[PDB]
Each structure stands twice: as structure tokens, then as C-alpha cells.
Amino acid sequence: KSEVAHRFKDLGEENFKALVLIAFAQYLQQCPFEDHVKLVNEVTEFAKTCVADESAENCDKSLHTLFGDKLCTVATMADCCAKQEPERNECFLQHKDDNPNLPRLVRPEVDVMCTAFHDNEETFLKKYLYEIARRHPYFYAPELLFFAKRYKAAFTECCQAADKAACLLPKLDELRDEGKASSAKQRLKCASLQKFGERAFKAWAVARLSQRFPKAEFAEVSKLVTDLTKVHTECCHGDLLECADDRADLAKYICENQDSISSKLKECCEKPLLEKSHCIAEVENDEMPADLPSLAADFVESKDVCKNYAEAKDVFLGMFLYEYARRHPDYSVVLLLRLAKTYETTLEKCCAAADPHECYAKVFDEFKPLVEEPQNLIKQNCELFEQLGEYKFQNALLVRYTKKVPQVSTPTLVEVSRNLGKVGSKCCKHPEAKRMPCAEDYLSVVLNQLCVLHEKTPVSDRVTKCCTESLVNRRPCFSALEVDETYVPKEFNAETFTFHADICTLSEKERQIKKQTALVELVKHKPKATKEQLKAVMDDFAAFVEKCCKADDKETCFAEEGKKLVAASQAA
């Protein structure tokens, strides 16, 4: 009874107040900061009355009831409040915006920010949680607390340091970059649960955890998957308090049972809570017993397989994925899942036909082309990555993917292609025994970010097709797409190819965005243009963007010479 009191007792006021602000800012994204803080405090003072007396005023109500009722004291969508629980919460989830119409979060001067932090400490943190949760409504809530704690620590020392700027900026860029990664990775976890089901998540966890805790028994990995699924099920459906509380329940059980799980968790468990759970998620793979028997025994070369399979199909298939994953930390998670269903298929087929053992004999030969295909793409794209730059490797993927799906909105095409290009620096560096999990599972995260940005205003049938068909075959589904022949080229708009002298005031990162954006509009205009025709026009831009930022008259340099640029760039 009194769940709000149970979660307040288990989390503490600070984390309770913080998580509720995230929950509110995630749902009602467009409501300003001060409005959300009003609701949070009104709930918190109400929670304290429940901790003091759990049977008192409305304390026995569900969390979704209290939160949804409270949320809708400002919500004017409006239709989402004629409904009851869970019907209201369900439509609160489906109304989450992966691209809220919110301004670009401009950063003030370091002296100005440091003043604000010292002005009000607690207010400055809430405004960090508010602007992140309202723009990433699928942000892992417990991680965002650890992000806030670290966002707090970055300002504590760098506002007290000699050169505040050189201390703070690289810390705020490191947090922002990893912050996006934590949202995009979590966005893929919430897609699986909501769009594909509980079993599609369990299969994901069994493979990844067995890769990371290879020495742990199957019964131990199944327990971890069960509790971890429940945690992300709560976080993906808006049950943030139960998600954060049960995520601590998980980290506790992991750390007091390290002997049965992993040897790499020693230091992770000596850390405080928000760092402990963050450490266990980021811990590297343990060593595999090395003395494991070949997998053919008990899944192929053994008899009574279709009797062990039929007897309990899910636990038997989990045992196969468990056994295959722990032996292969060099495989990507998606591959292991492909082999899980490929193995499951050949059982469904061969556990009915005459003499089962016959047709499932060399099922391991079906795995061979499945393993080769990503290795031949990662090896090839890594070769392409290193003969170009990272920025050039993005320009190549911009042309390659704008030709694949030219219906997709240009800002989404650019944003996704840049996140696609970042796999090179991140994973090509690693050896080929570490490349596949790094490279392909990261591309899975980037392609899901393309799905959700496209699912809002769908425009490309092939994007919808690949995104809805499956999770594990998404990467090859996009990898197989060729140049869209049917796409009618977009007409020449004089606005979309004219830069202005204000580009000389933008950062090198933002100036890349603008030049890279003009590349998409160029490919959408001449989708039959060759690599050498687009490089011949892309170089004319950067030279034009560089000579017209030093010329004493900048405005008239971007003019006239900016129309001597477009007329020359045409024909091809």
C-alpha cells in the first residue's frame, strides 16, 4: 500500500524529486521549467504525508494515477486526459516526441553559468534535468541522475579553478556527447520492448550478458535478464521510480554475488550507487572458461534435440544463445540473435520432417555466410573510413544514404549520417576481435534513431519497411538498399544553396552541418551525380566558404560570387 511512500523511502527525497521532474518533463515536453517544478514540489510534499501516514489522503492510489492527475493540471494533448489508467498513461507514452519543437540550447559564458550555479545550486541541476528529459523523452532516468551528479561535479571544481573555461568546456562536451549515446542506446531498448515485445528484449539481454558474464551459469544469466527486463520495462513505460529502485535492487544482487557472475566487477561495486550501476553497465567482458566443449554436441551431433526443444522451446533456445554468445565476444549481438532465429527456424522445420537429424545436420553451415557478411562490410567501410577523414566518411555516407532513401527529411539524413560516420573513429581503431560488437550494434543504435525520427512523419516506404520488418535484420535491410530509381529529383530552390556571412560566426562543427546539409539538397536535386561530380561541387563550396570569410566585404563575397558558384555547379 502507498507506493509513492514506498518509493520515497527507498530512493530518498533528492532522487525522488529528481526522477519525478524527469517523468513530467518527458511527458509534457513543451511546458516550461517553472511549471514542472511547481508540480514536482506539490507531489513531493504530498509524498511526505504518505511516508508519515501511508493510509492517509489518496496515498493508496497508483503512481500513474497521481502523476497523470497532477500532470493534467497544466496539460491543455488534452484528449489524453479524458482517459483512465492505464489508458491515459498508454497515450501519454505514444504522444512522446522524438523531435520536440524546442529551441537550440545555447550555452552562456562560463563566468555567467558559474555565477548561476553558485547563485542557486539545486535550481541549476533541475534546469539541466529539465532541458535533457524534455528533449530526450526516452532517456534512461537512473543514468540521467548519474549524469546530473557528474554535471554538478564538473561545475563544482571548474568554477573554483584558475582558468574556468579550459576546465569546464571539455567536461560539458564530454558529458553532452556521452549523454546523447545514453539516450540513443536507451531509445533502442524502448523500441524493442514497445514495438517487438518482452521476448525480443530477453533474447537481446541473454546474448549480451552471456558475452559479458561467460563464467556465470545459465540460471544466473536468466535471473539477471528477468530483473533487467523488468527494470527497462518500467523505464520505457514511464514507471521511473520502480525502474530506478529495482535498478538498485539489481546492482545490489550483482555486487553481493560477484563470485557467481564476473571477476571484473570488483572496483565497480566499491563505488557509490549512481557510479556502481553505471560501472556494471560499462564493465568489459570477463574471460571465457576456454575449456568449453564444441557447440555441435547437445544442439546438432546429440540426439533428443527435437525432444529437448519441444519440451520447453524458449529455455532451450535461451541455452543455445547463452552458449553461443559466451564463446563469441567477437560477434555483434545482432548476429547472435540472427543465429538464434536461424537455429530456431531449422528446428521448427526439421522437428516435423522425416528423420530430424538429417536436415539440421550442417545447420552450422547456414551461420557461415551470416557471419561473413558484416565482417566484409565493417572491413570495407573501415578501409573507406581511413583513406578519407571522418568528415569525408560522413560525406560519402550522406550521398550513399540520401540516394537510398531520398524521401527522408534532410536534417534527419544529416544527423543520422554523421552518427553513422562516427562508427569509424569509435570502432575501426579496435582489433577485428572487438570490431563487430562495437561497429554493428552501434549502427543498430543509429538506424533506430533514423526509424524514430522518420516514424513521426513517414515519407519513405523502404524506411518504414526495414524499421517494422524486424530488429536484428535492420542493418542488412538498409545495407542491401540501392539507389532509389523511382525518386523524382527535387527542383532547384535558390534559397537552399545560398549561405550568408553569418556562417563565419558559426563553429567548425556547425559550419560542417551547413555544408553537409547543402550536400543532401544537392543529391536530392541530381540523384544521378557521380562521386567525382559531387566532390567537384563540394570543394567549390568549402573554397567559397573560406575565401568569403576573409574578404574585407563578406556580404557581397557571399553574393554575386555565391551565384557564380551555383550557375557553374549546374549541368552536372
Q: How far is CA 232 from CA 191, 202, 252, 281, 564, in A?
A: 11, 11, 17, 13, 55
Are 355 and 486 in contact by the 8 Å Cβ rule? The answer is no
| Helix locations, 328-471, DSSP H | 333-350, 356-359, 367-387, 390-404, 410-421, 423, 435-456, 461-469
Using CA atoms, how far apart are residues 288 and 266, in angstroms rounded to an integer?
A: 17
- Long-range CB contacts (within 8 A, 24+) of 247-255: 247/142, 247/277, 248/10, 248/142, 248/273, 248/277, 250/224, 250/277, 251/276, 251/277, 251/280, 253/227, 254/224, 254/280, 255/280
Annotated binding-site residues read 3, 10, 64, 230, 234, 237, 239, 242, 245, 249
Segment (H or E) for 490: none
Angle, in degrees to the nearest 10, between helices 33-52 and 3-11? 100
> Mutual orientation of helices 3-11 and 240-255 as an angle, nearest 10°?
50
Binding residues for Zn(2+): 64, 237, 239
Q: How far apart are CA 365 and CA 346, in angstroms?
A: 12
Helix intervals (H) in 422-489: 423, 435-456, 461-469, 474-480
Record the cell numbers describing residue 209, joined without a space. 550478458
- Which residues neighbour 22 within 8 Å (Cβ) at sequence distance 6 or greater? 129, 133, 139, 141, 144, 240
Work out the number of other CB atoms within 10 angstroms of the CB of residue 77: 9
Binding residues for Ca(2+), as ranges, are 3, 10, 234, 239, 242, 245, 249
User: CA triplet 348, 352, 358: central angle to 5 degrees?
Assistant: 90
